[PDB]
Structure formats: structure tokens, C-alpha cells
Amino acid sequence: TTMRILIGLLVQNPELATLVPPLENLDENKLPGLGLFRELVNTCLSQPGLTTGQLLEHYRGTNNAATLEKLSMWDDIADKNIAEQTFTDSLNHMFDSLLELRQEELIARERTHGLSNEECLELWTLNQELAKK
Amino acid sequence: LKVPPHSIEAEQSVLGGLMLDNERWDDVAERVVADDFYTRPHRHIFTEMARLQESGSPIDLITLAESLERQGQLDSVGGCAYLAELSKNTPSAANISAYADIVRERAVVREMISVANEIAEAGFDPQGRTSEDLLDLAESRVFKIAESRANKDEGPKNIADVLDATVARIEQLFQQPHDGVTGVNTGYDDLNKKTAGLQPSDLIIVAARPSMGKTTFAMNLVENAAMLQDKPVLIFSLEMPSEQIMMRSLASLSRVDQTKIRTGQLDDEDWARISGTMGILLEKRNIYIDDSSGLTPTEVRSRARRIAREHGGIGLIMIDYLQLMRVPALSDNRTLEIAEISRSLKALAKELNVPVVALSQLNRSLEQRADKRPVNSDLRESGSIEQDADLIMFIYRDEVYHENSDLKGIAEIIIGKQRNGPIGTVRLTFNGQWSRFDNYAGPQYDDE
Amino acid sequence: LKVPPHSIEAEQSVLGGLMLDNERWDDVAERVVADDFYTRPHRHIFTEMARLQESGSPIDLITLAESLERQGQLDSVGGCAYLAELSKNTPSAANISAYADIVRERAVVREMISVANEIAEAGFDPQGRTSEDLLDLAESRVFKIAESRANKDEGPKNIADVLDATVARIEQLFQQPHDGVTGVNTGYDDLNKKTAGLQPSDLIIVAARPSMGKTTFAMNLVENAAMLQDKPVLIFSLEMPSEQIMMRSLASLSRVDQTKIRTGQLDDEDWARISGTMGILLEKRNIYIDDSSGLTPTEVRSRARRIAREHGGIGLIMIDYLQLMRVPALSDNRTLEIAEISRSLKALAKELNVPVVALSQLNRSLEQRADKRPVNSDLRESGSIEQDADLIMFIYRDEVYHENSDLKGIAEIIIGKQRNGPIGTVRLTFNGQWSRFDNYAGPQYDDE
DNA sequence: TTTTTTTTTTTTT
Ligand SMILES: Nc1ncnc2c1ncn2[C@@H]1O[C@H](COP(=O)(O)OP(=O)(O)O)[C@@H](O)[C@H]1O
Ligand SMILES: Nc1ncnc2c1ncn2[C@@H]1O[C@H](COP(=O)(O)OP(=O)(O)O)[C@@H](O)[C@H]1O
Ligand code: ALF
Ligand code: ALF
Ligand SMILES: [Mg+2]
Ligand SMILES: [Mg+2]
User: Fold this and answer.
1) Looking at chain A, which terminus has fewer C-beta neighbours within 10 angstroms, N or C?
2) C21, C95, C97, C99: best to mutate for the A interface, most A CBs within 10 A
3) CA separation (Å) from C308 to B109, C234, C282, C287, C325?
4) Rounded to whole angstroms, how far apart are CA atoms C115 and B338?
């Protein structure tokens, strides 16, 4: 899954969190374990320029630290630019998931009571992102 | 139970793709039709799509939904959600050709299966039909299957089509004023008069006895081609390391005694020349060397394809030499192995539309004759080397055999075969010290 | 049940990325193969992926699903759901190269374990196999795995890379003031001038008619090389016993009539000379002699490597002579057997980076001519002897053929071939009594 | 078991 890889990239490269757009605009329950990712970004933004060890030290007393440590150990990539590119395209993938979930809901509402011209027109516009390539 | 073949997902993709880009409409239309689908609603959608296209309406979700709603088939095919899902599962519109090709294949198989069922039905119940009639129906059905293909296999072609293509080729050759060199420039004007350059899709061959200049001449052709065009040239050196080849090239281009280069006893001027040569080569950067040993025909084709794909095509490829390649499948019979290699090299040239220069060795029977110039039937192990080749050039240096020869340092390029063109001899000065063949400026001796 | 070493996660990443992108197929094709994958389902998918790619078709879930369905492997791999699941799980394909490498590493390690199991099983059940059979089997497998791990270097290289390496080497030789001694020092002034010593990675050939001075000249090269360097020199005397070889060399170095040594009729002064020679030889101790008969090319390679590994490299190798080696597999076709021997010797020279001097023999056709100087095409059974050799030296003593010859006691070394360098003739003085060739101090005659 | 094509060495007219 692309969720576990995100935190692994997050923990191994803390500075990547700096360029992460806000996520509070969306319900964290939409993705599994999404709230923690947003927790890390604000934590990084709380003290910009933080060491990798310090980032994990922020949650020393928490139980989820074990998952963070395992992800740090897994997928160790010496190159930094590649990791940044992987994080960036991954962040796009999550945005695709959000739009994908939205259109699935909009399909569900269509079955409930149908849709108007604006709604189906908006759905049509919602397929370009899922087929941008 | 047996389910007739079909690809619902491919049917979804072809329907989905065209709604974004309609430029590929002809590609889908010519390849497949609404009869190819296995699901009826998809047939309805495509029939509507074709109608809208014929009416000039752009192919899109809104137009399709409007047409279906007006015709009342929207409910049968689904709706906004169903049609939206159609485009949702499309991986990429550019691939639509493969999806269309898949759909055609599924329809063809379904057509064949139906024919088989029809044949079985007719056979089981004669219904008053005699044995001969049953044969006729099978023949007619088989012919229809071979007829519905719409070529796809390059069957016999009428002469009117061939004439139109050939005359077009001649007319365009007229416009470009190359004046003799239709193919790659060899670099030796006396050689261009006969060969007219190295034509694409050719299997050229350079043969001679050991230490006659076979690799020295081929490298001169490669150097001249690289400096006289812009496409990459690929070298397969199965006999020598890349360093030795480059040491010769520096000696040839910079005209410095290759003994000094190999030994390191270079002066200031020699360093100046070599620096000049290095600058030129690094400015172009269109020569690739692969010194791996014992390559099979498959490895040669794969590597050449990659270079062509990455750099926009090849201009020439050289192999050194033919007999060192291996075909592990055919290792018990050396004659079959060599025939397979030669066929593969000819096929590769056609595929990439590039001239292939493959060197070859010669038999020892040449050395038992009073006259020691090579002939076509001297190529070593050569079952089909003489038959597949379109041009064969032999290198002969008379000074090697007769010490008191008058042709001291005058090599001869004997053209032993040329499918489309004359044959003859060309004389070139041989400067071994520089590892070079030069134009023979001396008086021209008429060839007999 | 010890867990075999494998990594499913790397395989899943590789397969998913290839689904995402098609431009990296080459990146993985070189690195991994279908056999590399652990689980059979992955092996089936890769085989189908390769079949689609070599067909020049796009790679996608729909195409793969149909292709696997065609062969009936769709259900076996796990159904279309598994492929859809795998495509879903893969974010991108940036680090596929690393994933490809680990997958390659796992297979090699698994290959290593299997070989270890096979050797252990064979030892437990010899099935009549002797210790030699087991040792040869163990050596063969370790070599095979070693070769397998050494296939990565292959691939065409640009000219910028080759130019940098070549110029670097030329700079090195320029710094060293060796003054013509680039390889091993032959010990003769004229020979060094025409060849610049014996170069590493070469296959030199010494040929002549029976009883011409062929083993006498080769031993002189071995002696002179041994005293002019510090690396071991290895000798393979398939013809004569080591005692007879040492008897000759003790006569040549000490300049004592070898008849006296052979029959033991020496004097005090002769005993003084032999004592001096023995002291010098034992001071260096860098000559090894192997007089086993009928060795195969594998045995020659195996023994050469052991010497190189123990003493840190070999400075020269001598084989006496080429046609006495054996290749049991090609025991029917003599011509192919000799061709395989020549190919192996050249490969051995390249691997160790050492000059390999191999003696050969000439044909009887030479003796039916008016002129009896050797030529290249006289090498016996020479399928490829004259083709692979980088340098060929013939020994000619006119005295043997013309009893009134003015060239009494003078030997001609005829350089019949030299891939990188000129050719010509060199004259030495032959002292049969001492089994020695001395550089010719008499008047020098120009070479035509 | 038979037919084919390529190498290399000998002996005879
Ligand atoms: N420095 C030199 N001076 C004179 N001749 C040379 C020199 N270097 C190489 N040659 C000659 O160039 C000839 C061609 O070599 P090469 O192209 O390797 O032959 P092939 O590739 O046909 O076996 C050889 O016969 C060799 O004698
Ligand atoms: N004591 C001697 N006096 C004169 N000639 C000798 C003496 N010992 C050896 N020779 C000659 O040295 C020649 C070279 O022998 P050798 O190198 O073994 O021949 P091959 O080239 O077959 O190895 C022989 O032909 C022999 O006549
Ligand atoms: F030495 Al060659 F062809 F005989 F390269
Ligand atoms: F005695 Al020989 F070749 F004739 F070693
Ligand atoms: Mg060559
Ligand atoms: Mg001998």
C-alpha cells in the first residue's frame, strides 16, 4: 500500500514534510492512519529544521512509535531527490484517492435520487484527473 | 460450461477512450466495428457513437448521453454513472489501438467458434444434404473467414498498386540532388561511383585472408560515416577490446604512427594532433562500441533496437565478425548455425532499414591456386553467405604474396557481388603505419 | 524447513512498476529474468510480459489478463483480481532498478544454496564417482555461478567513456621511460624492436617443421623472461619430461656442450659453470614446470589460476605444443577440436592478462615447393590458429634444406603475422651444441 | 538408418 510508504519516507526524510499542503480540510478518517501524517507535518512546521532522530523523539511515549521505527528501517534509500520525487507523486496519488472517493459518493447519490445537469457535468470533469496521463 | 470469448474491459476502454480524443476515431473504426462486441449494450453505444460521428457531432459523454436519451436507449445502456464508469476504467487513450485490436481478435475467435458450431450442426444433421454439399459449406465458410480478415497478412498485390508506389519513390529521388550517393557516404569517391553508398536494408560483407586489413577497412568506413552524417553508428567488436579499436582510430584520424601511440613515445605535435581528434569526436558523439564476445543473433538485435529507439534511429552497424556469433540451439551443425546467423543479419537490416556491414573470413583453398585473388566461393563455412549478401567486397594486397610486386602499398577492393549494380575493382593506397586506406591518386588503370 | 532466501516485496514492486511504465523494460530485462522470480505466479506473469513486449505491444492489466488467459495461466497466477490488486499496491516505479537488483541477488544466493546441496548429496552418494570426479564437479559449479554473476558488464558504451579510458592508458605509458619494453622482454634486441616485447593478453604462436629449434627457442624466451622480471613463469611440457627440459636449459645457461651433460662426461670447469647456474636459478625460484600429458583446456586453466592466486599473478605461460591437448566432447571432428583449443587459450590469456606462448606445427605442403620458408596457411589442422593468433613467429634455418647455403649457423625468425605492428624477418645465430639462440652480431641485411 | 553440406590431411593418376 502507498500509505505505509508515506510515513517511511516521512520518518527517513523529515524535511519532506515541509512542502506538504494542509490536510485538515478533509476528514482524516477518509484514509487509514491519515491523521498521524497530518500530525507529523504540523509537528515539523512547529519546529522547522529538525533532525530525523528528534522527529521520532517527539513521540517517544506513544505506542505507535514502533510502527514509525519499522518504517524507518524499511525502504532505506540513500538518494534524497528520488525520495522527494516519490513523495511528491505519492501525494498526488492520495489527492487522486480523495477525488476517486468523492466521485464514488456522487455515483452513490445518483443511484439514490439521480443527478442534475450540473452534477453529471461535474462528474465528467472529475474523470480528467483520474486520466490525466 | 463454455463461455464464448470476449473482453468486457477492453470493450469498456475502447468506448471510454474515444470520448476524450476523437482523432483516433479512424483507427478504431477501420480496425473494429459494432458487430465485434459480445455485449449488446456496448453495440448500442458504438452504433450511437458512429451515428454521432457521421453527423459531425463531437464524440463525448454529453453528446452520447443526449443521443441515447433521445433514442431511449440510455436506460438500456445505463446512464450518466454507467457511461462515466466506461471512461473511468480506460487506462490510456493512446493504447486504444491495442484495445481495438483485442476486440477484433475476440470477435474473430467468436466468428470461428460460431462457424465451427454451424459446421457441427450441419454435419450432425444432413437435412437432405449429401457429403459433397457438406464439403462445399465447409469450404465456403473457411473462405469467408479468410475473406473477412481484410488482408492483415500482405497477400498477393495487384500490379497497379506496386507501380504507384515505385513511381512515387523514383520521383522523390529525382528532387533531392545528391548526385550519386543515394545511401551512406563511404568516403572514397571511387567506391561511391560503383556502390553509390551503402544502401539501407543491405547486408554488405567484407572478406579477406587474415591480416589483410579487414578490420582496418571497416573502421575507416565507420569513421567516414560518423563524420559525414548525424545518425548513431553501432560497432560490435567480438574480436578485439574497445581500447585497441580506439587506439587505431586515434592513429587513423590524427595520422600519427600507431606504434608511438601504442608505446607512448609521443612528441608535442603528436599530442596536438590527438587533442584535435579528441575534440571532434566528443563534439559529434554518435559512435557506440560493444566489445562483448560470443553474442547470439537475439542479443545483437535487442541491443541495436534499444540504440535506435533512444537516439531516433541508426545510420550504420558493423559486426566483427560473422563467424564469431553463436546460435546455441544449432550447435551440432556448424553449416546450419552459419546459415541461421546470416539470415538473422539480413532480417535485422530490413527491420531497422539500415545497412549492416558484417566481416567474414576466407577458406584456405585460395592459397593452393596460382592466382590468389578471392572469389565468391571462398567464404569460410559459407552456405548462404554468398546468397544472402547484396554486396561483397574483397580486400587484396598483392605485395603480401609477391615481394617484387609493382603494387607496393596499393590495395584492391574487388567487388565480387552486387545485386543491383555493376562489379569491378577499386585501388586504394594502404598506409598501415597510420592504419588507414587512402584514395589512390595515381593514374587510373582500366579494369578488365 | 529452512526458509530459502527470497524477497516477495521486491518482486511485487518490480512487476507493478513495469505495469505502470514501459520505458524501463530495458532496465529490468538486463537485471532480471523470468527464472529469477520465486513464486511461479510471478514467473508466469513475467513470461507473458516479455512475450507482449517482444511483440511490440503496450503493457497493461487488460492486455496481460487476456494474454495469460490465452495460455490458461490466468487462474494459476491467482485471477484478474490479483493483478488488479498488484497494480493498485504499486505507487510508482522510481526505484525499480534497486528492486530488480535485490531480486537478482536472491536468485543467485538461492542458486548458490542449490549447488551446495548438490555437491553435498553427491559426496554422500558417490555412485562410483572418485574423488577427482567430485573435485571437478565442485570446481565446475563454483565457476558456473561465478560466470553468472559476471554478466553485468556487457552493454554498448558511448565514445566519451571509451576515449577517457584510452587516453588515460596512453598517459600512463608516456610517464614510464621503459624505452620500447612495453611487455615482457624477449631478450633479443632486434625482436624487441619489431614487437616491443610480448604483450599481455596476447596469443603468440611459434611454428616450424619437426626438429627446427621450436622447443629450443621457446625455452630461451622462458629463461630470458624469468631473469628479467620477478613474476612466476609457468611451463606446460606435454611432449618431453621435465628432466630433459631441465637438462637442455642447464646447458644453455651455463654454455656447456649438452652432450657432456647428457652422458655425464663433465670436467671441473664444467662443474664450476653448472654450480653457478644452479645458484642463480635457486635464488629467484620463479619457474614452474608441468609435464602431464594430454591435458584438456579446463585443466590448463585450473592449474594456471592456482599458481596465479598463490604467488600473485603470472608473468608468462608456455605450452608445448598446441595440437597435443584434448577436448573429449569434440573427439570426432578434429578441426573443431583444434578450433576449441585455440579459442580457450586466447580466452585464458585475456582472463589472467598474461602473454600465452603456444607452439604449433606445420604442414607437409611446405616441402613440395621450390621455396621452403613457412607461410601462415601451413599451420597444421589450423582451423583458426592463424586467425586467433595476435603474433606468429616462424623458425627457418636454410642450412637444413640447402647443404651449400651461405647462411650456415644462422636462423631466421619470420614474423608471419602481427595484428598491431609491422612484419619482417630477424636473424639469430643457432648454437645447437648449447641449445641456444644468440642475437646475430654479424652484418645486418635489409629486409625486403 | 539414410541423405545432405562443410573442413582438414594423406595417397595415387
Ligand atoms: N605499425 C604498423 N606498421 C605497418 N603495418 C601495420 C602496423 N600496424 C598494423 N599493421 C598491419 O595492418 C594489417 C591489418 O590488420 P587487421 O586489420 O587486424 O587484419 P584483419 O583484421 O583483417 O585480421 C596487418 O597485416 C598488420 O601487419
Ligand atoms: N648436441 C647437439 N649438437 C648439434 N645439434 C643438436 C644437439 N642437440 C640438439 N641439436 C639439434 O637441435 C634441434 C632442435 O631440437 P628441438 O628444438 O627439440 O626440435 P623441435 O623444434 O621439434 O622441438 C634438433 O633438430 C637437433 O638436431
Ligand atoms: F587478425 Al584477423 F581477421 F585475421 F582480425
Ligand atoms: F621434436 Al618436435 F616438434 F619435431 F618437438
Ligand atoms: Mg580483424
Ligand atoms: Mg619440441
Assistant:
1) C
2) C95
3) 65, 10, 20, 12, 21
4) 35
Give the burial string for B390-428 (b: 16+ CB within 10 Å, else e). bbbbbbbbeebeeeeeeeeebbbbbbbbbeeeeeebbbb
Residue B319 bridge partners (DSSP): B236, B358
C-alpha dihedral, B323 to B326 to B327 to B331, nearest 10°: 80
The number of the ligand 3 atom at minimal distance from the alpha carbon of B239 is 5
CA distance C192 to C206: 16
* Å: B422 CA to D9 C1': 39
Contacts of B211 in chain C (CB under 8 A): 376, 417-419
The chains found to touch B (3+ Cβ pairs under 8 angstroms) are: A, C
Cβ–Cβ contact B94 with A under 8 A: no
Cβ proximity of C252 and C434 under 8 Å: yes
Return the C-alpha cell found at C419.
595484428
Separation CA B100–CA B10 (nearest Å):
7
Q: What angle do CA B312, B316, B320 make, to 5 degrees?
A: 130
Order of strands, edge to edge, in the sheet holding B410-418?
B436-439, B425-431, B410-418, B391-396, B203-207, B356-360, B316-320, B233-237, B287-290, C157-158
SS (H, E, C) C136-165: HHHHHHHHHHHHHCCCCCCCCEEHHHHHHH
Give Cα C438 to chain centroid, integer Å: 31
Q: How far apart are CA B185 and CA A131, in angstroms?
A: 48
Contact C412, C398 (CB under 8 A): yes
- How far apart CA C349 and CA C305 sit, in angstroms, is 11
CA-wise closest residue to C392 among C219, C194, C227: C194
To test the pocket of ligand 4, the residue of C205, C206, C209, C214 to mutate (highest count of ligand atoms within 8 Å of its CB) is C214
CA distances for C112 relative to B318, C36, C116, C213, angstroms:
38, 13, 6, 49
The x, y and z cell numbers of residue B250, run together, are: 586515434
C347 within 8 A of B324, measured Cβ to Cβ:
no
The long-range contacts involving A128-132, CB below 8 angstroms and separated by at least 24 positions, are A129/A95, A129/A96, A129/A99, A130/A96, A130/A99, A130/A100, A130/A103, A130/B88, A131/B20, A131/B87, A131/B88, A131/B90, A131/B92, A131/B93
What distance in Å separates residue A9's CA from the closest CA in chain B?
28
Contact B84, B15 (CB under 8 A): no
CB B96 within 8 A of CB B24: yes
User: Do the Cβ atoms of B428 and B410 come closer than 8 Å?
Assistant: yes
Partners of C436 in the beta sheet?
C431
Nearest protein residue to the C1' atom of D9, measured from CA = C381
Resolution in A: 2.8
The tally of CA atoms less than 13 A away on the side-chain side of residue B162 is 6
Distance of alpha carbon C92 from alpha carbon B338, whole angstroms: 45
How many contiguous H segments (helices) and E segments (strands) does chain B have? 17, 9
Contacts of B439 (CB under 8 A, 6+ apart): B188, B189, B190, B428, B429
**Way the structure was solved:** cryo-EM
**Is the peptide bond prior to B188 cis by the omega test (within 30 degrees of 0)?**
no
Q: For cell 480506460, what's the residue?
A: B90
B163-198 in b/e form (b: 16+ CB < 10 A) is: eeeeeeeeeeeeeeeeeebebbbbbbebbbebbbbb
Tell me if residue C364 falls in helix, strand or coil: coil
Q: Do C158 and B278 touch (CB under 8 A)?
A: no
Compute how many other C-beta atoms are within 10 angstroms of the C-beta atom of residue C273.
Answer: 18
Cβ atoms of residues C433 and C257 within 8 Å: yes
> 3-class DSSP state for residue C65?
helix
Location of C-alpha cell 595476435: C390
Residue A8 backbone phi and psi in degrees, to 5: -60, -45
Confirm if B87 and B16 have CB atoms less than 8 A apart.
yes
Contact C286, C226 (CB under 8 A): yes
